[PDB]
Structures are given as structure tokens and as C-alpha cells.
Design a protein around this ligand. Structure first.
Ligand SMILES: [Mg+2]
Ligand SMILES: [Mg+2]
Ligand SMILES: [Mg+2]
Ligand SMILES: [Mg+2]
Ligand SMILES: [Mg+2]
Ligand SMILES: [Mg+2]
Ligand SMILES: [Mg+2]
Ligand SMILES: [Mg+2]
Ligand SMILES: [Mg+2]
Ligand SMILES: [Mg+2]
Ligand SMILES: [Mg+2]
Ligand SMILES: [Mg+2]
Ligand SMILES: [Mg+2]
Ligand SMILES: [Mg+2]
Ligand SMILES: [Mg+2]
Ligand SMILES: [Mg+2]
Ligand SMILES: [Mg+2]
Ligand SMILES: [Mg+2]
Ligand SMILES: [Mg+2]
Ligand SMILES: [Mg+2]
Ligand SMILES: [Mg+2]
Ligand SMILES: [Mg+2]
Ligand SMILES: [Mg+2]
Ligand SMILES: [Mg+2]
Ligand SMILES: [Mg+2]
Ligand SMILES: [Mg+2]
Ligand SMILES: [Mg+2]
Ligand SMILES: [Mg+2]
Ligand SMILES: [Mg+2]
Ligand SMILES: [Mg+2]
Ligand SMILES: [Mg+2]
Ligand SMILES: [Mg+2]
Ligand SMILES: [Mg+2]
Ligand SMILES: [Mg+2]
Ligand SMILES: [Mg+2]
Ligand SMILES: [Mg+2]
Ligand SMILES: [Mg+2]
Ligand SMILES: [Mg+2]
Ligand SMILES: [Mg+2]
Ligand SMILES: [Mg+2]
Ligand SMILES: [Mg+2]
Ligand SMILES: [Mg+2]
Ligand SMILES: [Mg+2]
Lengths: 122, 26, 97, 14, 149, 46, 179, 206, 41, 87
RNA sequence: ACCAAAGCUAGCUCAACAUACUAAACAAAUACAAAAAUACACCAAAAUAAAAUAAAACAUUCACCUAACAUUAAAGUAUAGGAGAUAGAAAUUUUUAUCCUGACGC
RNA sequence: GUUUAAAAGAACCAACUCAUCUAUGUGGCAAAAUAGUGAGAAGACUUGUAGGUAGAGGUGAAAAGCCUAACGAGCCUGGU
RNA sequence: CACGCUUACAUCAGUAACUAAUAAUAUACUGAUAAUUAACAACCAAUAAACCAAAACAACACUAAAACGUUUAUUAAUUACAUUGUUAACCCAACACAGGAGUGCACCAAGGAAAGAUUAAAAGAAGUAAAAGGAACUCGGCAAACACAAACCCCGCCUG
């Protein structure tokens, strides 16, 4: 009999069984049977300029570490919006209906990189 | 493992007998 | 028939521990206590056996009647099969009849 | 009847 | 990137951009006779020809011309002490032919040192001398040579 | 004539007769998968 | 720039190649997004070079010079990924309030189990997808017995594990009479 | 990397993933379990680097420094006190270098010594008013300092030189995070000046 | 209460001690010695 | 090795054809015309970053096609390895 | 003298209590031929338990037989039964809270 | 391939398909084989792949044949 | 080549023992390291209309009435390089089994070795040859043969 514990890959089947190995698709099938590759589907690697970047893969051994303080939503809010909203309330122009000036986003569907749908891979 | 001490002591006696039969003391 | 070749460690059993010193202490609780509690109440064990005694068939019957609604599937099936076998054997098999 | 007894193999770990 | 969900493309969708790629490649020496303009990489299973091309052209700035990929299957023949098969993992091997006529040659990453070889030779000579001086004298016949008389 | 070679391997027939989809497309095959899961089988189907 | 896959030619035959310590989560959090995005590739090149060196050492049947650099680089990249994901999690919790970045639902498959079905991206709604429609998120009346069997099996496993722990504690107390 | 060990495992003063250990017990063995006294991490006073005294053995009443500790069997070893002699250099026609290796000791056979009077005392964990947990003796009534031991890596932070691929302390401690409400993706896009005008279409999730 | 026999060694020796001067497997094997000893008596 | 060109081995009917059967009275060739396909266009090569191969493709097409033609003509005349060509 | 022999542990079993009951892992992929990112649908169904056995055969019958009401009595009583084998209530009665949980179990 | 104005459920005889007779083999090469010898060999022919008919049944140019080496009715599990 | 098995394939090294039904050593054991690179193959348009006129060298016909297609009109993202199969002495038969295995090419230019070493007892299996006779053997001319022909009945028309 055949084997059941081994993985069922494309190498173990007939000619008509061609299963992918996990890569993402990059296009579709055109008119004359060929493959039309879409340049918007291929990932564009955004590489920065490492010329004047003074940072190495390792750090100094004598450099001190820090206590583990995982960044939280409350800490991020206190760092980015608490001073602005506090100053606005002290000045007396606070508007509870409009919070877009402090960084809040009502709907994610407007901008490019939304957070809940996660339109960006990485 | 057999729970018991009588068999162990009796076999100790048998071992002493075998030792005496093997190496007779002066 | 190969018997062990070494002496086992002598179990140092103290006959004066708490359990062995207080064993059966309240067996006469009803007699010496203006009967309110039967010695049945001192029996610790399964619920279907606290102050009761019977053969295997009666034990299985009582267990199924008392705690049968909480047993597992395989346990209840094995109990039913044991009940059936004991019924057939005790009511149809034997010598003295 | 044509009664035939098929042979039984042994486990391969032995 | 691998192990990450890609956005579904539709007509008019933005360009898919990856900022922190999760692909890690190795540069392996060809086991067979390879031409001069050909480089052999071991890439993850989720990497394509265009992905490796962009990887080599953007991160390392290599003028590549052609990319050819294959999937090498790892052996599932060896057994454990429980008679369970231990599978070596499959891997993707890519061959990249350079564009501008650059000739690549895998370097000798382990050149032996003359001083190290001389030190090893001196250690071997010292061990041989120690064995010779610890060897028993045949004219004694097993009598220990520690006691004087 | 000569017997014993009644098994002629073919992956299409294998996966169509004892495959995961074949087991899940029927209520009896779902019971088969549930029984194999209760027993703890490493392989539930082909 | 194909030489970046190898170390400096003066460190090729070296037996021991010392390096600094790894990046820690606090040091990553102290930096900005630009520096993290650049350090990602700075670490990626070192990781590729170290993997090349490891494969070449395996090929030459020689030990890799100080193999702890690869462990340090992987740890540093893991810390960087964790910091970026923590910032993303805080931002998405502040903007939307969702804990997870991918939509999902607590479903009950045909096997009676409770699973967390993640959602996939489809160009058509759910009531028009053939492949999705022939899926079943519900249990038939014949799965209750198997669910109860699983419950009883897990209960028996937990009970015998607890009994094992109790017996081990009693055995240790009897073996060490330091009380 | 962490190696996985079977539940029936025996610790023999060797690294669990070492060739000596793999030769001692191959992955097909499961020896009898030795009873190990339960000692939690909050009640382990024996650390690595402190001067302790031996209670039982041929070298009894002697004091030595702790070199290694094994929590899985409540073992501790001191350097050159309870020793047996073993050969390491072994060949077909030569032997030599009979080195004295050290046998492990139990916490019942070894107790910590205070640096004040150099006498065996019993150690008890106390909580000082300054928020520290320091081991305090009960025989004399004094505290025991922490025996700081050099790490197994062999590098000291006092004398260290930065290499070509190491950052300086200033560059490692330089804080440049501006905590705003933009993702890394949007930050990098605005930094590199990439312009994306079109937006995604309606995507269904189920 | 599992009860097993522990003195089977001596139970066998008490019969084998009467067959040590026999010929063949009757002086070794117990199944063949119990019959040869009974006939002897 | 020729497998790194890349070239791939195959097994099928090995035929020596000039463009017509040997019974054809016109057993000699004058001029061939070869149209390059769309896979080997100048724009496609420039996108592939292969500018020096714009002439390599022409040279390879010529060296293969014309050699096949002249070899078919010679073997139609009756010349082969052990009967090497005279004219 | 070979072959060999002996360990005491891994762990199991039966109960009590118990939160109240499909453990942990779930980055991606998983009911396309499972672990294959990505296209205009179809989705779902129920209809009594039977027999082996006992009645020394076997035809009506044959306790339990994967449906809760537990315990002490009424009571194996009234009743139901080829009135055979066997089956079998009810009305009416009794049941004091917690720890004292481990093992004449391997 | 040969004979035939014939691709005639014609003839001779290959590949191929069956298995008439004999001799070996009988824990054998083989839980049905080898060697020789036989029958058909343009057809009611052999054969590849894939699907369907499932046991109170299916299928059967009826041998009560075959339905994964034991079928007057498969095998496994449960009743047990 | 297809189907099927998955690394058993390749290089180096070792074989005291494990696999080869024995050795030598090694495609069948052990360890390390490498490998199968697409042009061949797989995935590779719908909606209506014109369409009776077989394949068999198809000229034209027979009966058993026969798979295999273009054109026209409307929409078919349009932009190099997508993904997958590429080893082998191999599969199904408990085995390194005298068995079972589809297709296209040729009958060698490719594959291999019947004998581990002796002697030449009986009996056994296979073959060759045999005076004179030529079925007298035997249930029967079974088998064998330098023959390989002609007739008479029984039962089924015949092929199957
Ligand atoms: Mg199997
Ligand atoms: Mg395939
Ligand atoms: Mg194939
Ligand atoms: Mg293309
Ligand atoms: Mg390919
Ligand atoms: Mg079989
Ligand atoms: Mg009866
Ligand atoms: Mg009877
Ligand atoms: Mg009868
Ligand atoms: Mg009967
Ligand atoms: Mg019944
Ligand atoms: Mg009546
Ligand atoms: Mg009667
Ligand atoms: Mg004919
Ligand atoms: Mg034959
Ligand atoms: Mg013959
Ligand atoms: Mg023939
Ligand atoms: Mg014929
Ligand atoms: Mg004929
Ligand atoms: Mg079928
Ligand atoms: Mg019937
Ligand atoms: Mg029928
Ligand atoms: Mg008939
Ligand atoms: Mg008949
Ligand atoms: Mg059968
Ligand atoms: Mg196989
Ligand atoms: Mg051998
Ligand atoms: Mg090998
Ligand atoms: Mg091949
Ligand atoms: Mg011979
Ligand atoms: Mg031979
Ligand atoms: Mg021979
Ligand atoms: Mg002879
Ligand atoms: Mg003869
Ligand atoms: Mg002859
Ligand atoms: Mg004659
Ligand atoms: Mg006659
Ligand atoms: Mg006669
Ligand atoms: Mg004849
Ligand atoms: Mg004749
Ligand atoms: Mg004749
Ligand atoms: Mg006939
Ligand atoms: Mg006729």
C-alpha cells in the first residue's frame, strides 16, 4: 500500500497534479494561453539608504540594558495625544465632536494603510 | 519485583551454602 | 523460579502512628453517645457503598441505580454488560440450582 | 468444500 | 515576505510594497561544474524568481540577468530509534546569471595558516617524543622503571 | 491465475476513494473521521 | 555588491570572531521608525552572511567560527519584530479597538470542536462563493456523543495526572522525613 | 536554541546536548528515577561563587568555592575538595595527565559559610526594609553578600573593545523615538517620498 | 491482593534432589522428573 | 556541462530534413529567413537587463539554423562523419 | 564458562471532593486530490431498534440492553404472563450541614 | 507479413490474449509457477486511464460464477 | 515516456557486526556533503449564429452510420522574468521473488553471465543418439518421433 504519514506534495502525484509550494500568485492567464504577470501584485521591496547610517547589527557589550516596559495603548496615548488635548481643554477650545486634529481616525477605509483590515503585509 | 522477605533470606542462606561449598574455610 | 539475590530494605513500620493509634476510635459512638449517629456515618468510600454490603450483581445494580447518571459512556456500557453477564450466570448457571 | 487455510506472517519487529 | 497575508489585488489597486522582508537567502557553492556568470542561492520555499531578482537588485545591488529556480526534495529514508522517519526539509535552489558580464567565483573561506600548521607539527612531534620516552625498555621485560634499586 | 497483486497504485483513485474531501462529503465519513480522532490516529485520511 | 554575503577577507581563516551583544527590546523601543527600518536590513545582510558562512562550514566539514553571532542576530531581529508589532498593536487598539489585526469568528466545525476561523480576502460576497458555501460551521446530532467522549477522555487524563502528582508528593514526603 | 529532554532523564554533570552526554545515555534509554528533594527557587540559598564548607566525606570540615550548581538534582560542586583522579589523555600506547576531577555534593552535605567568622552557619531568606532580599544567617545573625560570578561567555564589561560591527554606547542609548500616531509603513513612505494615489477596492472577509 | 508463589525454587528443588542420579533429561527437567521420582518411590 | 546553458535531453524521432524529402530535385538551399519571436525583442531584453545579448540571439539563431541547413544538404548529398564533405 | 538471572521505578486502578465539562498550540496554509492566498451561489434530510440468548425446540413472550430520580420499607406484594419461562409496580414511609481521602489495589 | 474481386464474427501465422495435454515443482521461482506443446489472432478482439452498480444486495453468454488470495453469500466494529 | 515508489540516485570515506540468502566490495548497508535549472508536461475564455454529407494513402463507396473544426458578431485585467513535475539500478507480489505490468522506437551501435572449487556413486530432472522389430507398451499412440496424412460414428449448426 501507499504511505499516509508523508506529506502530500506535488512531487507525489500525476502530471495533472501541480500544487504550489506556498508562493503567492503574481498574475493571471492571458488570451493565447500565456501568463500575464501584473506588476502591482509583485512585492516592491522598499529599501532605505544605508550609506550614512551609523548603526551596526551588534551593540556595545558595556552598554546598559533597560527594564522591560512593553509599550501599551495608554502609554502611547499619554505620549501623543494627552498633552495636546490637555492644552486644548486648558485653552477652552475643546471639541468632543471633532477629534481628527489629535490623530484619531473615524473610518479606516479612507487612508492607504488601514489597521483592522491590515492591507499591508509588512 | 516479588514482595517478600522469606524468599530473600532463604536464598541468602542458599548463597552462603554455595559459598561454603565453593571455598571451604580452614 | 529465580529468587532475588539481595536482601530488601527492612520496612520500618511504626505501629504507633496517628492512624494506627486512633483506629476505630468512635466505633461505639451510638452506644456511648445517646444514639444519634449510627456507625454507618463513619464509613468513608463510594456513595453506593456507605453502610451496605452485597454480592457483585447487587453491587453493580446499586451503583447503576445511584451514580449511573454521572458515569462515562464506556464505564456505563461496561457496567451494563457486567450486569447482564452476572444476571445470566447467577440465574442460569451453577451446580446446586 | 474447497477449504484453504491462508498463511499468517509474523510481526517484522521480531 | 513569507508567513504573512498579502492584500487581495483588484483592478486599480495600489502597488504592493514590502518594507521589512522576511526572506533570508544563503549563497552556496555549486556542487557541479557551473559557468562563471552563474551564482547559486538557497532561497525560502515562498520566494519566486521576481522576488529573488528584486532582492538581489535592491538590497545588494547586483546586475542580474536570469533567474532559474528548482525545488530539492529532502530525504525521508533515515529512521529513528522508534522506527519513525526523520525527514530532511526540502529547499529551493536558485541559479542567477549575471548581466554585465561579471564573473563570480566562490572564495576559499577557510585558508590554512602556516603558523598553525607548524604549531600542529610541533605538537605532533612532542606527542611522539612523549610516547617514545614513556615506552617501556625492551631490555627490562615489564619491570617498573620508577624504583631506583 | 496468480493472486496477491490486487493492489494497483494510483493516487487519483486513492484520494478520490479515501481522501479527506471524500470522507467529509458524507455523514458516515464524518463519523469515520470522528472515530479516528477519538482513537487518536496520527493519520485520519489519505 | 555580491561580496556582502561574506565577511571581511581578513576574518576568513580566523578561529574565533568576537562580536558585540544583541539588541534588546528597550534599545529597539528607544529608536525611531526610520532607524528600525534601516536596522532591519542592516541585520538582514549580517544574517544572510552568517547563513552563507554556516552552509560553507558544513560543506567544508569545519566548525563555524563562533556560531553565536547567528543566534545573536536572530534574537535582535526577533526583538525588532516584537517592538514594531507592539507599536502596531497599540496604534490599532487606539484607532479601531480590535485586539487582532485579522478578522475572525469563533465557529463550530462539523467535528463539534470550537475553532477560531480566520477570514480570507474574497472579491465576491459570502453567499456567492461556491468553495466557501460547501463548508459547514455547525455540528450534526451525531457529534454530541463524540463531544461527550472527548470530554470524558480529557477528564480521565486530568484525573490520572492529578493522582500521579499526589502519589509523587506522598512518595517524596515519605522519602525525606525532614518535617 | 533549546534541546528537548525525555521525562525519564538523568543529569550527569554534563551538558544535555553534549557528545559526552549523548555517549553516556543515547536517546533510547530511560533509567530509574532518583528521588530529588523539592526545593523551590525561593528557597535555594546555594549560589555559584561563594565559600562553602563540606560536612561529610574524606575531606570533611574543609572549605571551598562553589564552581557549578545543578538544580535538577540539588547538586553543587566545589573545586578541589571532594575529588577522584581520572585520566583524560588516553591512546593505544600512551596515557598521562591524571587530573583530579570533583564529585558533586548535596545541599544536605554542604552549607554556606559567612565571611565574618569562617564558621558553618544556617542560611535563612529574609526581607530587608530597603526592598531587597538578602540571605541572613541565624547562628551569628549577619547577612551574606551575593557571590557575583563571571558568566560562562568569558567576556568582561570592564575591558571590552568595540569591533567594526558594534555600536557605541552613545549610539545604543541615543533616544530618537517620536511617539506619533503613524505606522512604520506610512513613516517610511513619507520619508522616502513615495507617492501612492490609488486606493484599495472593497474586499470581503469571511 | 495479587498473591504469587515465591518459594517455587525450593518447591522444585525438593523434587529435583531425588533425580540427580538419573540419566537423560529426567535429572534436569521438572516435568520429566516428577514422573521419574514417583516411579522411583 | 551543456545542461547549464540550459539545454535539456529528450528522446524522440531524430530526423535529417532539408525542407523536403530526398526525392525532391531541389536538394540545395539559397537563402533562409528567420523572424525573431516576441520573447527575444530588444525591449524585452532591455527590461531583462540583457543588452549584450541582443546580438547573441542573432548569432545563435544563425549558427544553429544555417548549420542545420548545410548539414541536411551534405547528408542529402551523401556525406557524414566517416564520409566527410569534399566541397 | 557461555546463554543467562535479580533489582525499583516509570506509571497505572478504584473511589471522595471539585471548579461546573470538547487541555496546550493556533504567524501563514487547511473539507481543489486537507494544510494550494484570490470570482456570481445553491444549501440541506428525517421514518420504532434487531438478533445472538432463555422458554432445555420454537412461532406469543425473553430482566439490563447507551431514554435520570436517588436511599430505607411496602415487596418480590398487587398485578402481567404459549397464566409457561419469566416480568413486576404504586398508594404510603425513611434519609442532618463541612473537614476528618485515601487504599488488608499492581 | 501471406492467400484472398474482402477488415468474410473466412484461412496460414507473428506481436498480443487465453490456457488443451504432458513432465517438473508441491514450505516450490510461484498461497497456481517453469518447459515443451496447444486455441484465437480485423473481432461477440485485447488493453491503458477515469467513473458507476455494495451484501435482505450488486453483477452474471447460470459455473449457484465473481464482488481485494477462505463467498450457498464479502470484510470490520458492536451486540459479545 | 506514462502510471507508481519517494532519494533507495551522485561524490568522498568505512565495513568487526548490521542489508546482499556466501565472499570479494557496494546500485541495495553506514556517515558526511551535494543534486533534478524549461523550450518538454500540468494549470492555460465565455455568449449567439452559419454549419446533414465519416474515418480506412480517400479517387469514391459499404454498413454497425462513426471521436477529432473553422468563420462571423459582443465583451476577453495587458504589464520583461509567474507556480509546479525533472535523480535512480525504481512499480504491484511478506523478499535484491524464474510471476503481473500501458505506449513509441530498433533487434544491437544497446543489455548482460548458465559454472564458489573439485570428483564424475546410486536415485531424480533435461537433452542427444541407437542394431532388428515398429504400438507387440498402455485405460487410451500419454509422451516421443527422420511422421506431421486419409477416413467412420456420438454430441453440439458454426465464431464465441
Ligand atoms: Mg498503509
Ligand atoms: Mg505531480
Ligand atoms: Mg510520474
Ligand atoms: Mg510569463
Ligand atoms: Mg521548473
Ligand atoms: Mg494484500
Ligand atoms: Mg431457546
Ligand atoms: Mg442449554
Ligand atoms: Mg433446532
Ligand atoms: Mg436452538
Ligand atoms: Mg431484547
Ligand atoms: Mg388472558
Ligand atoms: Mg411448556
Ligand atoms: Mg479469422
Ligand atoms: Mg505455458
Ligand atoms: Mg522433448
Ligand atoms: Mg506459443
Ligand atoms: Mg491458429
Ligand atoms: Mg481455426
Ligand atoms: Mg469505480
Ligand atoms: Mg435467511
Ligand atoms: Mg442476488
Ligand atoms: Mg446449472
Ligand atoms: Mg450445481
Ligand atoms: Mg475475501
Ligand atoms: Mg516502496
Ligand atoms: Mg554479510
Ligand atoms: Mg548511501
Ligand atoms: Mg530520468
Ligand atoms: Mg561444475
Ligand atoms: Mg553464475
Ligand atoms: Mg557453483
Ligand atoms: Mg544418473
Ligand atoms: Mg533420461
Ligand atoms: Mg531423439
Ligand atoms: Mg532402435
Ligand atoms: Mg495393446
Ligand atoms: Mg498388454
Ligand atoms: Mg501427443
Ligand atoms: Mg498424429
Ligand atoms: Mg501421421
Ligand atoms: Mg460447440
Ligand atoms: Mg456454416
Amino acid at each position: 500500500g501507499a504511505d499516509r504519514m508523508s506529506k502530500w506534495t506535488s512531487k507525489r502525484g500525476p502530471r495533472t497534479f501541480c500544487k504550489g509550494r506556498g508562493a503567492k500568485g503574481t498574475g493571471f492567464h492571458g488570451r493565447d494561453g500565456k501568463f500575464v504577470q501584473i506588476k502591482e501584485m509583485i512585492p516592491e521591496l522598499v529599501v532605505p539608504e544605508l550609506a550614512g547610517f551609523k548603526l551596526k547589527p551588534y551593540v556595545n557589550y558595556r552598554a546598559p540594558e533597560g527594564t522591560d516596559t512593553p509599550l501599551t495603548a495608554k502609554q502611547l496615548f499619554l505620549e501623543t495625544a494627552a498633552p495636546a488635548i490637555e492644552k486644548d481643554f486648558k485653552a477652552g477650545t475643546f471639541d468632543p465632536e471633532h477629534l481628527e486634529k489629535y490623530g484619531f481616525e473615524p473610518t479606516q477605509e479612507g487612508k492607504l494603510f488601514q489597521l483592522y483590515p491590515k492591507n499591508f503585509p509588512r | 519485583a516479588k514482595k517478600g522477605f522469606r524468599a530473600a533470606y532463604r536464598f541468602q542462606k542458599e548463597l552462603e551454602r554455595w559459598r561454603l561449598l565453593r571455598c571451604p574455610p580452614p | 523460579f529465580h529468587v532475588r539475590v539481595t536482601l530488601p530494605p527492612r520496612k520500618v513500620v511504626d505501629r504507633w502512628n496517628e492512624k494506627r493509634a486512633m483506629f476505630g476510635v468512635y466505633d461505639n459512638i451510638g452506644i456511648l453517645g445517646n444514639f444519634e449517629k449510627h456507625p454507618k456515618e463513619l464509613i468513608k468510600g463510594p456513595i453506593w457503598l456507605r453502610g451496605w454490603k452485597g454480592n457483585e450483581l447487587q453491587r453493580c445494580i446499586r451503583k447503576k441505580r445511584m451514580v449511573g447518571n454521572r458515569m462515562f459512556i464506556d464505564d456505563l456500557h461496561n457496567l451494563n454488560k457486567r450486569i447482564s453477564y452476572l444476571y445470566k450466570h447467577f440465574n442460569r448457571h451453577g451446580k446446586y440450582r | 468444500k474447497k477449504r484453504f487455510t491462508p498463511p499468517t506472517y509474523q510481526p517484522k519487529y521480531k | 515576505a513569507r508567513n504573512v497575508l498579502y492584500p487581495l489585488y483588484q483592478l486599480g489597486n495600489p502597488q504592493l510594497r514590502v518594507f521589512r522582508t522576511n526572506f533570508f537567502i544563503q549563497l552556496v557553492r555549486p556542487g557541479t561544474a557551473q559557468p562563471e556568470d552563474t551564482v547559486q542561492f538557497r532561497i525560502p520555499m515562498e520566494m519566486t524568481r521576481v522576488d529573488l531578482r528584486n532582492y538581489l537588485e535592491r538590497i545588494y545591488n547586483v546586475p542580474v540577468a536570469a533567474v532559474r529556480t528548482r525545488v530539492q526534495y529532502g530525504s525521508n529514508r533515515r529512521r529513528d530509534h522508534r522506527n519513525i522517519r526523520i525527514k530532511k526539509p526540502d529547499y529551493k535552489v536558485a541559479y542567477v546569471q549575471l548581466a554585465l558580464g561579471q564573473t563570480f567565483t566562490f572564495p576559499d573561506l577557510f585558508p590554512e595558516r602556516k603558523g598553525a600548521s607548524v604549531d600542529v607539527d610541533v605538537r605532533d612531534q612532542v606527542l611522539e617524543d612523549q610516547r617514545q620516552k614513556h615506552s617501556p625498555d625492551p631490555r627490562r621485560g615489564g619491570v617498573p622503571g620508577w624504583f631506583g634499586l | 491465475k496468480a493472486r496477491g497483486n490486487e493492489y494497483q497504485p494510483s493516487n487519483i483513485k486513492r484520494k478520490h476513494k479515501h481522501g479527506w474531501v471524500r470522507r467529509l462529503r458524507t455523514p458516515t465519513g464524518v463519523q469515520v473521521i470522528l472515530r479516528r480522532m477519538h482513537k487518536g490516529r496520527k493519520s485520519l485520511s489519505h | 555588491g555580491l561580496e556582502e554575503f561574506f565577511d571581511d577577507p581578513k576574518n576568513w581563516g580566523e578561529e574565533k570572531v568576537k562580536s558585540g551583544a544583541s539588541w534588546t527590546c528597550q534599545q529597539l523601543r528607544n529608536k525611531s521608525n526610520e532607524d528600525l527600518h534601516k536596522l532591519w536590513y542592516v541585520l538582514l545582510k549580517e544574517r544572510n552572511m552568517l547563513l552563507t558562512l554556516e552552509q560553507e562550514a558544513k560543506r567544508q566539514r569545519l566548525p563555524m567560527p563562533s556560531p553565536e553571532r547567528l543566534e545573536k542576530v536572530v534574537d535582535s531581529m526577533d526583538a525588532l519584530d516584537k517592538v514594531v508589532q507592539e507599536r502596531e498593536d497599540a496604534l490599532r487598539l487606539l484607532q479601531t479597538g480590535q485586539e487582532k489585526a485579522r478578522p475572525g469568528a469563533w465557529r463550530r466545525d462539523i467535528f463539534g470542536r470550537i475553532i477560531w476561523h480566520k477570514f480570507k480576502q474574497w472579491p465576491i460576497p459570502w453567499y456567492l462563493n461556491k468553495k466557501y458555501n460547501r463548508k459547514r460551521f455547525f455540528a450534526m446530532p451525531y457529534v454530541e456523543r463524540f463531544v461527550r467522549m472527548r470530554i470524558e477522555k480529557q477528564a480521565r487524563i486530568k484525573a490520572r495526572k492529578r493522582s500521579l502528582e499526589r502519589k509523587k508528593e506522598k512518595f517524596l514526603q515519605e522519602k525525606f522525613p525532614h518535617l | 536554541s533549546k534541546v528537548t529532554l525525555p521525562p525519564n532523564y538523568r543529569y550527569g554533570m554534563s551538558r544535555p546536548g553534549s557528545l559526552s552526554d549523548k555517549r553516556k545515555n543515547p536517546p533510547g534509554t530511560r533509567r530509574r528515577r532518583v528521588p530529588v528533594e523539592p526545593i523551590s527557587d525561593e528557597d535555594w540559598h546555594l549560589f555559584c561563587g561563594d565559600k562553602v564548607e563540606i560536612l561529610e566525606g574524606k575531606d570533611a570540615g574543609k572549605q571551598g568555592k562553589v564552581v557549578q550548581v545543578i538544580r535538577q538534582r540539588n547538586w553543587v560542586v566545589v573545586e578541589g575538595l571532594n575529588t577522584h583522579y581520572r585520566y583524560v589523555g588516553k591512546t593505544v600506547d600512551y596515557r598521562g595527565t591524571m587530573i583530579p576531577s570533583e564529585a558533586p555534593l548535596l545541599h544536605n552535605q554542604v552549607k554556606l559559610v559567612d565571611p565574618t567568622d569562617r564558621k558553618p552557619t544556617d542560611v535563612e531568606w529574609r526581607f530587608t526594609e530597603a526592598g531587597e532580599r538578602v540571605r541572613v544567617s541565624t547562628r551569628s545573625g549577619r547577612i551574606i553578600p551575593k557571590p557575583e560570578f563571571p558568566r560562562a561567555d568569558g567576556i568582561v564589561p570592564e575591558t571590552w573593545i568595540d569591533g567594526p560591527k558594534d555600536t557605541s554606547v552613545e549610539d545604543a542609548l541615543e533616544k530618537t523615538y517620536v511617539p506619533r500616531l503613524k505606522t512604520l509603513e506610512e513613516e517610511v513612505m513619507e520619508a522616502m517620498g513615495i507617492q501612492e494615489t490609488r486606493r484599495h477596492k472593497k474586499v470581503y472577509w469571511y | 491482593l495479587r498473591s504469587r508463589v515465591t518459594d517455587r525454587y525450593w518447591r522444585v528443588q525438593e523434587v529435583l534432589k531425588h533425580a540427580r542420579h538419573f540419566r537423560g533429561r529426567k535429572n534436569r527437567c521438572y516435568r520429566l522428573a516428577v514422573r521419574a521420582v514417583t516411579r522411583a518411590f | 556541462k551543456p545542461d547549464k546553458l540550459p539545454l535539456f535531453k529528450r528522446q524522440y524521432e531524430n530526423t535529417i530534413f532539408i525542407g523536403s524529402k530526398t526525392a525532391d530535385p531541389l536538394c540545395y538551399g539559397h537563402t533562409q529567413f528567420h523572424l525573431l519571436p516576441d520573447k527575444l525583442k530588444r525591449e524585452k531584453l532591455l527590461k531583462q537587463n540583457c543588452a549584450d545579448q541582443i546580438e547573441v540571439v542573432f548569432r545563435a539563431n544563425a549558427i544553429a539554423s544555417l548549420f542545420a541547413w548545410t548539414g541536411a544538404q551534405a547528408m542529402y548529398q551523401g556525406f557524414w562523419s566517416e564520409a566527410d564533405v569534399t566541397r
